[PDB]
Amino acid sequence: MGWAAAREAAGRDMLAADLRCSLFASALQSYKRDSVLRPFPASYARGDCKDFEALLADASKLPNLKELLQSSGDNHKRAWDLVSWILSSKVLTIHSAGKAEFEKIQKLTGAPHTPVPAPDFLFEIEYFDPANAKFYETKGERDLIYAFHGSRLENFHSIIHNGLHCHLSLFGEGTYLTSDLSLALIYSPHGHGWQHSLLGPILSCVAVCEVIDHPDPPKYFVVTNNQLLRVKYLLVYSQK
Numbered sequence: 218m219g220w221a222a223a224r225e226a227a228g229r230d231m232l233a234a235d236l237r238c239s240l241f242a243s244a245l246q247s248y249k250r251d252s253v254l255r256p257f258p259a260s261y262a263r264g265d266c267k268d269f270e271a272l273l274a275d276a277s278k279l280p281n282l283k284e285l286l287q288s289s290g291d292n293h294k295r296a297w298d299l300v301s302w303i304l305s306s307k308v309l310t311i312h313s314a315g316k317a318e319f320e321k322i323q324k325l326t327g328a329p330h331t332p333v334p335a336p337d338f339l340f341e342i343e344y345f346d347p348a349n350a351k352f353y354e355t356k357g358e359r360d361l362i363y364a365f366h367g368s369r370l371e372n373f374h375s376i377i378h379n380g381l382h383c384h385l386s387l388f389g390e391g392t393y394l395t396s397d398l399s400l401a402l403i404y405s406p407h408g409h410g411w412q413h414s415l416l417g418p419i420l421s422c423v424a425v426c427e428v429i430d431h432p433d434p435p436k437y438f439v440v441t442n443n444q445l446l447r448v449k450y451l452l453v454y455s456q457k
């Protein structure tokens with residue numbers, strides 16, 4: 218996606234654009250970047266060779282999104298290229314939501330049984346076709362379940378773009394979900410986001426999943442076929 222298209226997208230929802238940059242920074246900065254930074258910007262790869270040192274360096278030169286947008290940049294050329302890539306997707310996009318939807322989420326997942334904190338920011342994932350149509354076609358007459366999934370921040374760039382995978386032979390294969398946000402949170406410790414983020418530099422992210430209902434101390438449950446679920450919301454918490 219081009220620079221003018223990037224500037225319109227970022228201007229329409231800066232906190233959603235900022236999140237996508239913060240989640241990219243978190244994956245990039247992680248020692249696990251080789252595996253967690255997927256999708257990877259092809260501009261920073263030769264063949265199979267990913268140049269994480271070029272990418273880490275260029276990432277650390279990105280100004281905050283207010284500065285990037287207010288600066289008429291042909292000098293912020295490398296930054297625009299990178300932010301344009303970050304905010305591009307033909308499959309989905311992300312939308313800032315108000316805590317008028319945290320009420321909705323709570324109603325969908327079920328009233329909490331244990332004290333829980335309120336997210337500082339909430340975000341919804343909009344899926345475009347064929348992906349969107351495919352999900353509802355798979356769903357059919359079956360009703361949708363809403364459950365939480367906690368994870369380390371460096372995993373959310375890959376979780377969002379590639380979806381939740383199923384494994385990591387051993388113990389327990391499939392994705393673990395819970396209707397108690399207090400259980401999901403123990404799997405979502407604070408991680409390092411982006412120093413120029415409007416959300417703040419240290420964040421915790423919890424996913425809300427749309428689960429197609431099929432026979433599948435707080436209670437939890439496991440989803441083995443990954444065609445039956447998708448991240449629909451993101452609960453973001455900033456450390457103060």
Ligand SMILES: Nc1ncnc2c1ncn2[C@@H]1O[C@H](C(=O)N2CCN(CC(=O)Nc3cccc4c3CNC4=O)CC2)[C@@H](O)[C@H]1O
Nearest residue numbers: 366367368372375376379380381382384385393401404437
């Ligand atoms: N596309 C992806 N990119 C990077 N990580 C991805 C990914 N898709 C899934 N994952 C990540 O894989 C990790 C994974 O398989 N794991 C890690 C931990 N483990 C058990 C476990 O998940 N238990 C478990 C138990 C109860 C509740 C919750 C969890 C997790 N979240 C919860 O809310 C099972 C194997 C996982 O943490 C997940 O968030």
